A paper describes a structure:
[name] ([name]) is a major contributor to the progression of many chronic inflammatory diseases and a well-established target for pharmacologic intervention. Mammalian [name] is a secreted cytokine that exerts its biologic effects through binding to two cell surface receptors, IL-6Rα and gp130 (3–5). The co-crystal structure reveals a large binding interface characterized by extensive shape complementarity between the binding partners in which the [name] engages [name] through two distinct domains, a stem-loop domain and a G-quartet domain. The [name]·[name] binding interface overlaps with the contact zones between [name] and its two cell surface receptors, IL-6Rα and gp130, thereby providing a compelling rationale for the potent inhibitory activity of the [name] against [name]-mediated signaling.
Author numbering:
A (entry chain A): 14 to 43, 61 to 130, 141 to 184
B (entry chain C): 16 to 43, 60 to 130, 136 to 184
The structure:
Amino acid sequence: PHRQPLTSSERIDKQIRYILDGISALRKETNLNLPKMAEKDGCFQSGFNEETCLVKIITGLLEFEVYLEYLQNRFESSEEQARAVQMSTKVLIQFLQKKAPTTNASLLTKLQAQNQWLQDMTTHLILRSFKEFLQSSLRALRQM
Amino acid sequence: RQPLTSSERIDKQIRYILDGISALRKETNNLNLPKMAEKDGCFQSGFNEETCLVKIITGLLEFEVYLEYLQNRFESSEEQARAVQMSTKVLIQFLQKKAITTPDPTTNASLLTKLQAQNQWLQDMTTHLILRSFKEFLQSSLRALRQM
DNA sequence: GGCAGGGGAAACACGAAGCGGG
DNA sequence: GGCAGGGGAAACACGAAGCGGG
Ligand code: NA
Ligand code: NA
């Protein structure tokens, strides 16, 4: 019998690492107001805040789900992987909730009716803003 | 592993799907579901490879929107529904190479969005009869192909 | 649950190597 | 492509036993 039973932080930490790896295996296999961390949210060392930041992470991740749904009908060569980023994020959003809709429908169909040049631009910068957001989340969480 | 013919891939592709349905169906009237009839030509008499073949494709194209409806009907088996759905996508392609009637890409949604507005018993019934038809349909397709 | 939680892991100027059905 | 194609198989009245990443 082999697996060490983990605490909340370890579990959450491992999950983000799981997601960052996945995303990167989509970065290799490849108007916009995407969530970027701010100092007022209290996730950086300057003006740090364990309460305010956790709210920004859960709020943020939740706002990324639609843009993750977007990425699904975008990777016709890496389908299951792009799904595994979608579900792992959901999974992540549930680990961060222990510790503590048609606007989407419309803005999906806007992104999804742009030309390929625009759609691959959207893809590119979604993935990079997801990476930004996760890395700095892993960092903040490596404290509280 | 050893290699197989195009016909012996189709036969396995169906068998694979039929076992992924038996698994689904274990956990979980006014509709219009694809149903083999004498007119199709998939039976020992009144038989015809061409028409039978066409209807096997056609009927499987018709089923797709209903399998998409299945995804949410197995929240506690999301991948089993998905395998079944995408393993059917493949089957169609295989069949299409061995070769049509494709329903509108805008009428299938009105049905899908409506189905989802039924109370939880009608969904339960709708689910049990999607599987039943689809199984019987694939049961007949297999037998027919094991002849032509 | 169970064999067990909720189908399946140090070096480059700091940005490739290497543990599981119903 | 490669190691190969296009991420991963008898016995009950006819309806359980048990094979591989980029
Ligand atoms: Na398990
Ligand atoms: Na389980």
